[PDB]
Design a protein around this ligand. Structure first.
Ligand SMILES: [Mg+2]
Lengths: 73, 32, 101, 550, 1280
RNA sequence: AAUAG
């Protein structure tokens, strides 16, 4: 059954903990991620902005696609 | 793509555009 | 800082250990100019000066181990180093390096 | 102690230092608005950046911005060093530094050659949408203020009352090409929120285009036959005919159809001198009906929209530049000025005020007789004054909108007024009906700080001047408006940040996902009239199920 | 007319006579500090109050005590000017007489064994200057008054917005000056709860039980009793007639309605009622009923009576039962239900529960609980309901005693409880929190007294601790008092308080407005983010007290206010405003100052009301206001009138002409921007004014005002000597007055403070006459800006939006040229390597840069310097520096090597060119004075000699003597010669003052007085500007599009009146140039001054010929006119003035295009506007950086123009770049421009090589983040 | 804190 969440709750419940920590409620996000042992694949814009890489949109999009090929191979 | 007039291109960050489009006008906001 | 409340002192503290990019570019230019000047010298004198000043080498060397190269002669190595400095001091091949003073 | 080191204040009383304030722990290092994530990672201070006050450059082109020479010298310093070294003017980089510090003429020539085709990014805070950052070609100017093109101000929400802009220099080739291709002002002329043009002319431009395209009865040179726009301009420059003279002009009009057919027709059209002189700058492929009318803000918006839809982008940019030049020139030539005699107060205002006061006294008498209750008295007094305000506004607008002129036959004819305030409001340059109401009619009923309406209204305008009580009542609402703006700014900022966070991952990743699902779209009906048409909802959407004819 | 006013009489367009002059504008500061420092024999205010509050200090054992006798303030070490030069606080020493009285242990307690009287130094008290400012660390500062919540009791409600239903919940809050807070609130179950210092709620009855109140006593206090008897075997109600007005009623003679008006039957009067038992069944007992035989309690208090209970009391023989009155409308069981939910039954249990709620997790003991409860509210040491708090408390609860009490008691708490219950019932109303009768003004004196008392308590603790020891044979009072805590408290308040603000000093108006500023923030006030809409609003009580226009535009809106023109603070700190009495129907010139509470009762007419010759009102119905609501009122019901038409607005708003034609949103901007104007080279009066300019100029203190009248003996650009009149001499006085003028002194905003004489030798002067004009003053009138010829027309888009087009002539005449004085410092310190030396021996610098330096290495006075020029030369010792091998080879080739010291010198900042006007050298005591410092010392000694000799000569000439003058000169020599107390490690300081002439340029901000602000876009040539038929070009072209949508029409009226005034001035100039007869000049002047039906009667017949010539000379540049706010010049007067000057009545002329010569198609509004040059100059705002300093931890560029920092690319800019799709630009911003240490160096090298490619890496901030997350014991890592 | 947008 699909659920409707508010924008704040939806933002806090994303897959990546870097974006969720960067939004708000850093302590809760980091504690949950640490106990769970989460892994962030850096798929969105905020993670790549934080780590200094090209964002997977626009001029960087193709670049990221190429990497997804090399990991596939 | 409303800013370009044609079909949207691959790699366009449409979520950021949507959020900015909604958020920018927030200051203007208050049987016959 | 001052009458503010969202300011902090640590936000205004420089990193005095950093090297200016102008200085780094000047160092690279000096390396290139020194290499070009050394290229206009006899290979023996160039190698002797390189060992005696540590250019393109991990360590500097005194006259003894520079003599250990081919002929172990402190008085000879000293003479050839003096000759190399005299030729490099000639205005014909020193205008490039003069600009770095 | 370990709890205080990790997270101070979570366990209990926060440990404080000698400054009597809580010590900052590692959790405080990483978290919050002032934490590492938001202060240093999602935003940073950058090099090759500057800031200055912005003035207006009315001579600029849409892709140009006026940049100060000293500011450019500081921003483009490594580039100047590189070109001094390349062309042999400086032996080393220290010599180049000395030359730049001494400000030699050859340094200025090198700076021109550096900035020849190097785009530069202009930013104004708050950056509410992506049009808050745009790329321009810099033109070096003497001075300390950035010159900004007028037609982009609406995109920046920028006015010249003390605004400051930041400037950034894209360094690598990829950044330069991104500035030229994506962020350049000539690429961004449509609003990404709605698709409507964002470089629509405003204020003086509109006013000028309004003044040149108006029509006057029995003007000098009426009834003259003109070979074309050039001869209309010649007649205007020779004082043969006025701008507002009704003439017949031979017009050659090219129409570009949907299929691309280009049909050229020459014919004699009844128009004014100003309309033909304005036709002189209209690109080929548009009807003359777009110009053969008085041009307010809406009409110029329609002109630009049709130019974009039927001709493209380059023609639209050139047309916008020419429109803004012409509007500025003829707004200057008009001599439009505001004066105390431009605020015409109708003679019916005093009679209406007297009638309202008398009938209010009658209603008070009825209240003293117990016929009506206090709430009824309040309500009907308020309705009385609202009706009086509407009547006074109507009489004032009617008096201000028209004038009587003598035509060629000698009779009296009704003409639309050339009153400066009326022209400013009607053209859409600045002003509305309510503001003219306040200038020349009644200020009307005002509200208390809680929101209730005061029975007696301000029966004076700003031309006559208010007394002390009326001004105090006005301040009641002025303060409320200012406070509301100040607080809603923060509320809107928080909402926008939340939306950007929730939607930041949405990127167009494919072309077609191969789904048959879709949404049902119908005209929006909220009563007996359409709120919005199906065309406006469907413009730009891909059909999911075949549209069979009914 | 005074002489200064006679020199240039301003035409008055007002019509209403003024019965009250505007009082001194800086009274709110001076009166407060006088209350603080002046000795009070009654001991109610200031230092005496604080001393009597803390002293006597009693030892715990009883051995001895320290008693306060008196205090005095010593003589300052330095004067104000000397304190500003040296950089020290202007203050006076506090010396307090104390007696240590030691008692005798063997003798009975209270026997004076010994007394030791001595004077103790109790700190240094900062002093207020003659103008209401303080000098703290050499900086002029203003302490801003606070608008806070008055102490007392306030009754409020949640307005039905907390619980699910409406259920409007009522609360009462007792707030003291010092101590804990008391809260009584209702829950949605109609139970009363108490909170002490905002912690967990407790049932209210507890607070009664701790006071010794039994449950029966509680019920008696909070309820009325309905009684019952057993009369002749029948039930007996005691009838209360008022209550009666569901059963059959007794009194068979006068039977009332049975199970189905009251007054008619109650008229006869009976005392007997018979009722059913079911009427008893529901009631609740009022007393505890005991049986001696049984020994038990048959029925308890607050217990519902039952049938079995009735039977039990029947057997017990009790015949009378009283129960509580309880209704649903007028009376309520709230206290009974509260008693039911109360688990406490005795004083000890209540004390224990209060202790548990106070101090959880501590074992409760009886003594600790008792001490806690006594200390909370009934101890004078920890509780203080101040005199104002007590008065407001008593007025709220209707108590007419305990006027001097400062602590709560049983009566106070019970009355607050009863009033809250009454408000719940319906009788009474809640309090208005924003009412100015509930908000108090707290000024400098009160805050200083509070902090001084804090310091006194700090030292009292230690004094008691020492006196408890006992060994006091050799102890003197000055061995017991440590003044450092008190000094720390006062310096904390005067230098680091939020309300101690760096003084606004752009112009006189800025200073006056800053001193009359009231903040809701500060210690004990509100917070910007936490403040709501209601506090920011304009309350109806602000009329005549707080200006509704002047308030900051921004997040501070509504929280900072300006005192109104006639507003005043009463003795309790509540604002009051003056009103004229209306006695017997006539408006008397007697003035009563009314506060907000007193104002509501009366009906107060406005100053615009029409008046007759007898002093009464003309109209039968006049527009007045009552209870904050305006309306039409009968003439006979009017009790008061407003004294002035500018009573509601502040000084800055009072300076705006035609304010009544401006929208309040723009009047706000005009008032705010009048305070940012920068003084120019030549001060020019406003042609159109309001009449308040003289008041601001005189009461600001910038001018030099004659203390006594007389004849100006000597005038000079720096000194004015006045020969005093024979009637005003103190017997045996020299008879002269000397005024030394401030010449080119830096202000707090780096502007110029300069005083220029406006008197001639031999000119008579009276008291109060202006002798010299300070900055922004012209002949005693405030001159903030310049009068500019203005055309309202568009000009080719150069006045687009709010842009301003300015003629080149305005630049040529230096009409907006300003002088800015900037202070620069070179500090030579002591380092580990060695001592930094100030010298002209600067390595790697040629003789070109040493030309302006002297032998000592300091620039000459009068040296014209540009950016990068050396002002003070300094060399810092440097350590051994490693040389790269290439540098070693370069040294071997060319052997030069001189790197003992490093050039760390003071240089003129870039893009700054000016003249050195002053150099000051401070040397530490014990360090050699160089040649330059000796030269300055000799010059100062010679100047002191010369000034003293000249002053002595003039005073002895007036009188017509060695020891006193020798003493004065010796003191001056000691002050000049002695060393300077500098910061530790500082060897020498050299301060250089630079004067910079800033001319108007594109980018500068210019404004009028109506919110019409803008930025200059172009400096137009004179031949290109619009001109009239006479060839006169306009000076400034303004956009007409900014007038209608902003509803500031006062600017058009000002333009018209300025045109008229300049026309009349031109006519006067023509009459002077043609040398017409003085009779014609007199006739013209009288015609000008008789225009309109004004309140001004200027008679030129009473002016001498020389006076008329001077007046005509001062009217050459235009006739100054006064248009008061809400009493201004009507349009008919403006048109008449235009007609007199032979100008069009519409104010519109025919202009021609200077570029083509062609007439513009419509007439253009041309006139004169007063325009200002705001302190927002593009010189101070243009910044650019390519590469510079970086942060220590984040390795990011610093922030600020002072640090040569970079702009911040914030989150929203990143969002914009993401929306565009510019990934590479964003990566440039994140990595190679901010914190990629290797990448940014590689990028610089690539650009120098012309390659334009980047090799991005990891930002350092992310590495820092990883390190901190790891430091939190969390393994965060990167996987490949 | 204050100020500008
Ligand atoms: Mg602006």
């Amino acid at each position: 059954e699909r659920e409707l969440l508010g924008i704040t709750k939806a933002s806090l419940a994303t897959e990546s903990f870097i974006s969720a920590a960067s939004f708000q409620e850093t302590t809760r996000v980091l504690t949950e991620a640490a106990v769970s042992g989460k892994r962030d694949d850096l798929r969105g814009l905020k993670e790549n902005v934080i780590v200094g890489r090209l964002i997977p949109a626009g001029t960087g999009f193709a670049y990221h696609q190429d990497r997804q090929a090399k990991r596939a191979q | 793509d409303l800013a370009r007039g044609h079909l949207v291109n691959q790699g366009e960050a449409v979520g950021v555009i949507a959020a900015q489009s909604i958020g920018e006008p927030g200051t203007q906001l208050t049987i016959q | 800082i001052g009458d503010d409340e969202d300011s902090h002192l640590g936000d205004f503290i420089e990193d005095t250990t950093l090297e200016l990019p102008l200085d780094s570019a000047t160092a690279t230019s000096l390396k290139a100019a020194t290499r070009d000047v050394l290229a206009g010298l006899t290979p023996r004198e160039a190698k002797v000066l390189r060992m005696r000043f540590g250019i393109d080498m991990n360590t500097d060397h005194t006259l003894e181990e520079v003599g250990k190269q081919f002929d172990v002669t402190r008085e000879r190595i000293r003479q050839i180093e003096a000759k190399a400095l005299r030729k490099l001091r000639h205005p014909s091949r020193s205008e490039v390096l003069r600009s770095f003073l | 102690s370990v709890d205080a080191l990790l997270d101070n204040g979570r366990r209990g009383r926060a440990i404080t230092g000698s400054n009597k304030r809580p010590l900052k722990s590692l959790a405080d290092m990483i978290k919050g608005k002032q934490g590492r994530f938001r202060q240093n990672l999602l935003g940073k201070r950058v090099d090759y950046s500057g800031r200055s006050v912005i003035t207006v450059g009315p001579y600029l082109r849409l892709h140009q911005c006026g940049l100060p020479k000293k500011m450019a010298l500081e921003l483009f310093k490594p580039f100047i060093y590189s070109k001094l070294e390349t062309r042999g003017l400086a032996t080393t980089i220290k010599a180049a530094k000395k030359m730049v510090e001494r400000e030699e003429a050859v340094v200025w020539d090198i700076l021109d050659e550096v900035i020849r085709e190097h785009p530069v990014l202009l930013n104004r805070a708050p950056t509410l949408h992506r049009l808050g950052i745009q790329a321009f070609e810099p033109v070096l100017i003497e001075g300390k203020a950035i010159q900004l093109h007028p037609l982009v101000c609406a995109a920046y929400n920028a006015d010249f009352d003390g605004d400051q802009m930041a400037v950034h220099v894209p360094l690598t080739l990829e950044a330069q090409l991104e500035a030229r291709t994506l962020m350049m002002s000539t690429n961004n002329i449509l609003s990404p929120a709605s698709g409507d043009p964002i470089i629509v002319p405003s204020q003086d431009v509109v006013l000028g285009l309004y003044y040149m395209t108006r029509e006057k009865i029995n003007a000098k040179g009426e009834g003259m036959y003109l070979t074309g726009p050039a001869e209309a301009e010649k007649a205007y420059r020779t004082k043969t005919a006025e701008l507002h003279a009704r003439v017949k002009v031979r017009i050659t009009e090219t129409i570009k159809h949907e299929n691309g057919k280009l049909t050229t027709e020459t014919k004699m059209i009844d128009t004014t001198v100003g309309r033909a002189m304005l036709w002189q700058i209209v690109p080929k492929g548009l009807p003359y009906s777009l110009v053969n009318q008085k041009l307010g803000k809406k009409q110029i918006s329609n002109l630009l929209n049709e130019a974009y839809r039927k001709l493209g982008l380059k023609d639209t940019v050139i047309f916008a530049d020419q429109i803004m030049y012409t509007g500025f020139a003829y707004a200057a030539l008009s001599g439009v000025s505001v004066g105390i005699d431009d605020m015409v107060v109708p003679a019916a205002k005093y009679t209406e005020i007297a009638e309202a006061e008398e009938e209010v006294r009658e209603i008070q008498e009825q209240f003293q007789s117990g016929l009506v209750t206090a709430g009824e008295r309040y309500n009907k007094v308020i309705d009385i004054w609202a009706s009086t305000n509407d009547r006074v506004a109507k009489a004032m607008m009617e008096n201000l909108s028209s004038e009587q002129v003598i035509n060629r036959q000698g009779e009296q004819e009704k003409q639309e007024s050339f009153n400066s305030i009326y022209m400013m409001a009607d053209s859409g340059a600045r002003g509305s009906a309510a503001q003219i109401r306040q200038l020349a009619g009644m200020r009307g009923l005002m509200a208390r700080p809680d929101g209730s309406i005061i029975e007696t209204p301000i029966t004076a305008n700003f031309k006559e001047g208010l007394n002390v009580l009326q001004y105090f009542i006005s301040t009641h609402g002025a303060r409320k408006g200012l406070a509301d703006t100040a607080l809603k700014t923060a509320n809107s900022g928080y909402l926008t940040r939340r939306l950007v966070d929730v939607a930041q991952d949405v990127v167009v990743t494919e072309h077609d996902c191969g789904t048959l699902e879709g949404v049902v779209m119908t005209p929006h009906i909220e009563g007996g009239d359409v709120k919005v048409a199906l065309t406006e909802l469907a413009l730009g959407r891909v059909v999911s199920e075949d549209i069979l004819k009914p | 007319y005074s002489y200064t006013e006679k020199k240039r009489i301003r035409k008055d367009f007002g019509t209403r006579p003024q019965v009250l002059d505007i009082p001194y504008l800086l009274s709110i500061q001076l009166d407060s500090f006088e209350k603080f420092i002046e000795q009070d024999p009654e001991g109610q205010y200031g230092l005496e109050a604080a001393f009597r509050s803390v002293f006597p200090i009693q030892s715990y054992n009883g051995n001895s005590e320290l008693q306060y006798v008196s205090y005095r303030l010593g003589e300052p070490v330095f004067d104000v000017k000397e304190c500003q030069i040296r950089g020290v606080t202007y203050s006076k020493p506090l010396r307090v007489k104390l007696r240590l009285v030691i008692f005798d242990k063997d003798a009975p307690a209270g026997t004076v064994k010994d007394i030791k009287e001595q004077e103790v130094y109790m700190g240094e008290i900062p002093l207020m200057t003659e103008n209401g400012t303080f000098v703290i660390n050499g900086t002029e500062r203003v302490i801003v008054s606070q608008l806070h919540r008055s102490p007392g009791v306030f009754f409020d409600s949640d307005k039905g917005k907390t619980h699910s239903s409406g259920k409007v919940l009522y609360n009462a809050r007792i707030i003291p000056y010092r101590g804990s807070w008391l809260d009584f609130e209702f829950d949605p179950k109609d139970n009363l709860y108490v909170r002490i210092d905002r912690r967990r709620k407790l049932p209210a009855s507890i607070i009664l039980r701790v006071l010794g109140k039994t449950s029966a006593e509680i019920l008696d206090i909070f309820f009325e009793k309905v009684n019952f008897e057993v009369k002749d075997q029948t039930l007996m109600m005691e009838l209360v007639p008022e209550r009666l007005r569901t059963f059959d009623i007794e009194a068979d003679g006068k039977v009332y309605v049975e199970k189905g008006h009251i007054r008619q039957l109650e008229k006869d009067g009976v005392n007997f009622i018979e009722v059913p038992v079911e009427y008893i069944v529901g009631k609740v007992s009022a007393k505890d009923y005991v049986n001696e035989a049984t020994g038990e309690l048959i029925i308890t208090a607050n217990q519902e009576i039952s049938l079995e209970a009735l039977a039990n009391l029947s057997q017990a023989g009790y015949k009378k039962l009283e129960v509580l009155f309880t209704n649903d409308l007028d009376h309520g069981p709230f206290m009974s239900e509260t008693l039911r939910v109360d688990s406490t039954t005795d004083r000890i249990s209540a004390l224990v529960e209060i202790y548990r709620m106070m101090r959880p997790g501590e074992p409760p003991t009886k003594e600790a609980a008792e001490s806690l409860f006594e200390s909370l509210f009934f101890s004078a040491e920890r509780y203080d309901l101040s005199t104002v708090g007590r008065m407001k408390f008593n007025s709220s609860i209707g108590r007419e005693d305990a006027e001097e009490q400062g602590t709560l008691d049983e009566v106070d708490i019970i009355e607050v409880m009863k009033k809250l219950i009454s408000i719940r019932n319906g009788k009474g109303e809640v309090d208005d929190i924003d009412h100015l009768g509930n908000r108090r003004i707290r000024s400098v004196g009160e805050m200083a007294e509070n902090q001084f008392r804090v310091g006194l308590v700090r030292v009292e603790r230690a004094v008691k601790e020492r006196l408890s020891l006992g060994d006091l044979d050799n102890v003197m009072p000055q061995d017991l008092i440590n003044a450092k805590p008190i000094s720390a408290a006062v310096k904390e308040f005067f230098g680091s308080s939020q309300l101690s603000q760096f003084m606004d000093q752009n112009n006189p108006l800025s200073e006056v407005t800053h001193k009359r500023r009231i903040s809701a923030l500060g210690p004990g006030g509100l917070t910007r983010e936490r403040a709501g809409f209601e506090v920011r609003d304009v309350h109806v009580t602000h009329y005549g007290r707080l200006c509704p226009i002047e308030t900051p535009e921004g997040p501070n809106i509504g929280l900072i206010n300006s005192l109104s023109a006639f507003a005043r603070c009463n003795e309790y700190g509540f604002l009051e405003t003056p009103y004229r009495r209306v006695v017997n129907g006539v408006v008397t010139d007697e003035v009563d100052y009314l506060s907000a509470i007193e104002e509501g009762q009366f009906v107060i007419a406005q100053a615009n009301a029409k008046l007759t010759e007898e002093g009464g009102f003309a109209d039968e119905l006049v527009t007045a206001r009552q209870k904050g609501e305006s309306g039409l009122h009968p003439r006979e019901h009017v009790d008061y009138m407003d004294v002035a038409t500018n009573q509601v607005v502040s000084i800055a708003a009072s300076l705006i002409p035609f304010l009544e034609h401006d929208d309040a949103n723009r009047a706000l901007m005009g008032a705010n921007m009048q305070r940012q104007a920068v003084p120019t080279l030549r001060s020019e009066k406003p042609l159109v004014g309001t009449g308040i300019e003289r008041n601001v100029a005189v009461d600001s203190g910038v001018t030099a005002v004659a203390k006594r009248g007389g004849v100006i003996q000597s005038v000079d650009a720096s000194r004015i000597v006045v020969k005093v009149n024979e009637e005003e001499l103190i017997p045996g006085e020299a008879g002269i007055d000397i005024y030394n003028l401030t010449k080119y002194t830096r202000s707090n905003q780096n502007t110029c403070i300069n005083q220029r004489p406006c008197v001639m030798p031999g000119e008579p002067v009276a008291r109060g006459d202006v002798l010299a004009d300070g900055p922004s003053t012209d002949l005693g009138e405030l001159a903030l800006g310049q009068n500019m010829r203005i055309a309202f027309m568009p000009w080719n888009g150069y006045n687009f939006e709010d842009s301003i087009l300015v003629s080149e002539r305005v630049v040529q005449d230096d009409r907006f040229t300003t002088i800015h004085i900037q202070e620069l410092s070179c500090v030579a310190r002591d380092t580990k390597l060695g001592a930094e030396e100030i010298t002209a021996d600067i390595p790697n610098v040629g003789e070109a840069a040493l030309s302006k330096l002297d032998e000592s290495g300091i620039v000459y006075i009068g040296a014209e310097v540009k950016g990068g020029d050396i002002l003070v030369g300094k060399v810092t010792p440097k350590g051994e520096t490693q040389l790269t091998p290439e540098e070693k080879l370069l040294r071997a080739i060319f052997g030069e090597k001189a790197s003992d010291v490093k050039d760390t010198s003071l240089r003129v900042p870039n893009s700054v060119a000016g003249t050195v006007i002053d150099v000051q050298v401070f040397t530490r005591d014990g360090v050699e004075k160089d040649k330059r410092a000796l030269e300055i010392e000799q010059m100062q000694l010679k100047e002191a000699k010369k000034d003293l000799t000249e002053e002595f000569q003039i005073l002895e000439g007036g009188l017509l003597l060695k020891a006193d003058f020798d003493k004065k000169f010796e003191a001056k020599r000691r002050k000049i010669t002695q060393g300077d107390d500098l910061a530790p490690g500082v060897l020498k300081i050299v301060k250089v003052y630079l004067a910079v002439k800033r001319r108007i340029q594109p980018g500068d901000k210019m404004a009028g007085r109506h919110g019409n602000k803008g930025v200059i876009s172009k400096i137009n040539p004179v031949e290109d500007m619009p001109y009239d038929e006479n060839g006169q070009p306009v000076d400034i072209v303004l956009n007409p599009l900014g007038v209608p949508s902003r509803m500031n029409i006062g600017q058009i009226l000002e333009v018209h009146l300025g045109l008229a005034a300049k026309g009349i001035g031109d006519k006067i100039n023509q009459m002077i140039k043609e040398q017409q007869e003085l009779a014609k000049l007199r006739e013209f002047l009288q015609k000008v001054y008789d225009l309109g039906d004004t309140r001004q009667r200027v008679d030129i017949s009473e002016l001498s010929d020389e006076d008329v010539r001077t007046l005509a000379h001062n009217l050459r540049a235009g006739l100054p006119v006064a248009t008061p706010v809400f009493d201004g010049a009507p349009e008919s007067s403006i048109k008449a003035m235009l007609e007199l000057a032979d100008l069009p009545a519409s104010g519109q002329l025919t202009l021609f295009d200077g570029r083509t010569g062609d007439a513009f198609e419509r007439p253009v509004t041309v006139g004169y506007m007063y325009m200002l040059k705001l302190n927002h100059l593009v010189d101070d705002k243009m910044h650019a950086r390519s590469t510079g300093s970086y942060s220590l931890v984040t390795q990011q560029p610093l922030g600020g123009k002072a640090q040569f920092g970079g702009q911040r690319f914030g989150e929203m800019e990143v969002w914009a770049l993401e929306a565009y799709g510019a990934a590479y630009t964003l990566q440039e911003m994140l990595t190679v421009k901010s914190d990629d240490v290797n990448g940014r160096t590689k990028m610089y090298k690539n650009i120098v090589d012309g390659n334009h490619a980047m090799e991005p890496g990891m930002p350092e901030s992310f590495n820092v983040l990883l390190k901190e997350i790891r430091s939190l014991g969390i393994n965060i890592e990167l996987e490949d």
